[PDB]
């Protein structure tokens, strides 16, 4: 059984190696009204589903580690803690439960703990003295993986009840996106449905009223093996592309709500980086740059990483080698994404499997 604090790897809690399924859903009906129930008992669909059983099982193991980590985080995350303390305590638990083992199992991307106007991609670098405040709105977004089968799942933390309606708006919008998702569903329809739900909410924060706006330049996305953003985008506003979701794809369904402009821009010091998946082999002679690329290739491959993780591996004086990798287009920087100063942003996110037989919200217990 799991300890308190959690320290037993998920693999040791399920001795037979069969990990728990997430929530299973029938796909939404078509506009004409034809149900998709036929998938659950179809001979061809069960065969295609069974063929990918090892892949779904890997996602389920990573999802169980993610659920146990986030229940642990909710039990202790409190104002007054530094953002570094929060990230290191969360990551220490995640490394243990996922039974971190090089590229076979581990952390899929850095722990995002973006605050207030910053909506995403913020994790502290060394020396960051930022402390979580009682009035902050903190987005905890972290990932686990087994064999590069990634769980991307996020939630918002608050201490002041004044943001409760903002959180409910975004949670309802994300649950709408999850409900609307399915094989052959136009991605633009998912976005329109999400916006319609999110914008039906009005919030009052310190005597100022706001209509909740989805962050138009943030979105959900397809997930590939060791590829957090596989190429398809799930909009959270109307006006997107009518491109459809397909059988066997994995999506992160996420929404962001804001009291600001509903648009993010790169801001602050960069902490997140990730190798460009489309860049092949590049011989490097420059020694510090060569060394850092070897470190990245061995420890992260195409998964996102952060500067704190390079520090933890014992690397130092690597910032110019890292900028060289960015300038060569081998690595890409992912700086914090912020709405206007004084604005509040919230996020909820789950990972879904578009299985031939059903839609499984694998990160939801």
Ligand X SMILES: O=C(NCc1cc(F)cc(Cl)c1)[C@@]1(O)CCN(c2ccccc2)C1=O
Distance, in Å, from the CA atom of 109 to the CA atom of 141, rounded to the nearest integer, reads 9
> Which residue, 135, 137, 136, 115, is CA-closest to 124?
115
262 binds, among Mn ion, ligand X, none (CB under 5 to 8 A by kind): none
343 Cβ contact partners less than 8 Å away, ≥ 6 residues apart: 116, 117, 258, 259, 260, 261
**Cα 177 → chain centroid:** 15
For residue 349, the minimal CB distance to Mn ion (Å) is: 5
221 is in an annotated binding site: yes
Is 254 an annotated catalytic residue? yes
257-280 burial code (b ≥16 CB/10 A, e <16): bbbbebebeebeebbbbbbeeeee
Is 219 a binding residue for ligand X by CB under 6 A? The answer is yes
Active-site residue identified among 66, 145, 221, 350: 221
* Interface positions, 153-192, toward ligand X (CB under 6 A): 154
Is 136 an annotated catalytic residue? no
Looking at beta carbons only, is 345 or 357 nearer to Mn ion? 345
Contact 338, 27 (CB under 8 A): no
Is 349 an annotated catalytic residue? yes
Of positions 91, 141, 172, 360, contacts Mn ion by CB under 5 A: 141
Is 44 an annotated catalytic residue? no
For residue 295, the minimal CB distance to ligand X (Å) is: 16
Gyration radius (Cα) of the chain, Å: 20
280 Cβ contact partners less than 8 Å away, ≥ 6 residues apart: none
360 binds, among Mn ion, ligand X, none (CB under 5 to 8 A by kind): none
121 is in an annotated binding site: yes
Of positions 55, 73, 97, 120, contacts ligand X by CB under 6 A: 120
Is 226 a binding residue for ligand X by CB under 6 A? The answer is no
Of positions 151, 166, 252, 322, contacts ligand X by CB under 6 A: 252
Looking at beta carbons only, is 27 or 142 nearer to ligand X? 142
137 Cβ contact partners less than 8 Å away, ≥ 6 residues apart: 115, 116, 156, 157, 158, 163, 166, 344, 345, 346
Active-site residue identified among 64, 349, 350, 360: 349
Interaction pattern, residues 79-118, with ligand X; x per rule: CB under 6 A = ------------------------------x--x------
85 Cβ contact partners less than 8 Å away, ≥ 6 residues apart: none
Under DSSP, is residue 213 helix (H, G, I), strand (E, B) or coil? strand
Q: What pairing do the DSSP bridges indicate for beta strands 345-354 and 105-115?
A: unpaired
Q: Which stretch binds ligand X (CB under 6 A): 14-22, 85-93, 198-206, 217-225?
A: 217-225
**Cα 155 → chain centroid:** 9
Is 141 a binding residue for ligand X by CB under 6 A? The answer is yes
Task: Provide the CB-side half-sphere exposure for 148 (13 A, CA).
Answer: 14
Is 152 a binding residue for Mn ion by CB under 5 A? The answer is yes
Contact 235, 188 (CB under 8 A): yes
Of positions 145, 149, 221, 355, contacts ligand X by CB under 6 A: 221
In eight-state DSSP terms, residue 311 is H
Is 152 a binding residue for ligand X by CB under 6 A? The answer is yes
Is 172 an annotated catalytic residue? no
Note the maximum CA span of the chain: 62
Of positions 107, 228, 292, 331, contacts ligand X by CB under 6 A: 228
- Which residues are at the interface with Mn ion (CB under 5 A)? 141, 152, 154, 252, 254, 349
Q: Annotated active-site positions, please?
A: 141, 152, 221, 229, 254, 349
- Which residues are at the interface with ligand X (CB under 6 A)? 109, 112, 120, 141, 152, 154, 218-219, 221, 228-229, 252, 254, 272, 274, 304, 334, 349
């Amino acid at each position: 059984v799991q300890t308190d604090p959690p320290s037993v790897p998920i693999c040791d809690l399920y001795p037979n190696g069969v990990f728990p399924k997430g929530q299973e859903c029938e796909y939404p009906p078509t506009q004409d009204g034809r149900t998709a129930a036929w998938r659950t008992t179809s001979e061809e669909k069960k065969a295609l589903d069974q063929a990918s059983e090892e892949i779904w099982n890997d996602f389920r193991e990573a999802a169980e580690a993610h659920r146990q980590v986030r229940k642990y985080v909710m039990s202790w995350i409190k104002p007054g803690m530094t953002m570094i303390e929060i990230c290191e305590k969360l990551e220490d638990c995640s490394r243990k439960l996922i039974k971190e083992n090089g590229l076979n199992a581990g952390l899929a991307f850095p722990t995002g703990c973006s605050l207030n106007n910053c909506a995403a991609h913020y994790t502290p670098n060394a020396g960051d003295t930022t402390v979580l405040q009682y009035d902050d709105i903190c987005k905890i977004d972290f990932g686990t993986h087994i064999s590069g089968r990634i769980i991307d799942c996020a939630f918002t933390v608050t201490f002041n009840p004044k943001y409760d309606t903002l959180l409910k708006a975004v949670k309802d919008a994300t649950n709408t996106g999850i409900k609307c998702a399915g094989i052959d569903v136009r991605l633009c329809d998912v976005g329109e449905a999400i916006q319609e739900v999110m914008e039906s909410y009005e919030v009052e924060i310190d005597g100022k009223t706001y209509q909740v706006k989805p962050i138009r330049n943030l979105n959900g996305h397809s997930i590939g093996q060791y590829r957090i953003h596989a190429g398809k985008t799930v909009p959270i506003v109307k006006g997107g592309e009518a491109t459809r979701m397909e059988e066997g794809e994995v999506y992160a369904i996420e929404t962001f709500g804001s009291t600001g402009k509903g648009v993010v821009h790169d801001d602050m010091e960069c902490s997140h980086y990730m190798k460009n998946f489309d860049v092949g082999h590049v011989p490097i002679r420059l020694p510090r740059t060569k060394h850092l690329l070897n470190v990245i290739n061995e420890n992260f491959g195409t998964l996102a990483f952060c500067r704190r993780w390079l520090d933890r591996l014992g690397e130092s004086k690597y910032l110019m080698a890292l900028k060289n990798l960015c300038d060569l287009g081998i690595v890409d920087p992912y700086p914090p994404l912020c709405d206007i100063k004084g604005s509040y942003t919230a996020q909820f996110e789950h990972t879904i499997l578009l299985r031939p037989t059903c839609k499984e919200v694998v990160s939801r217990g």
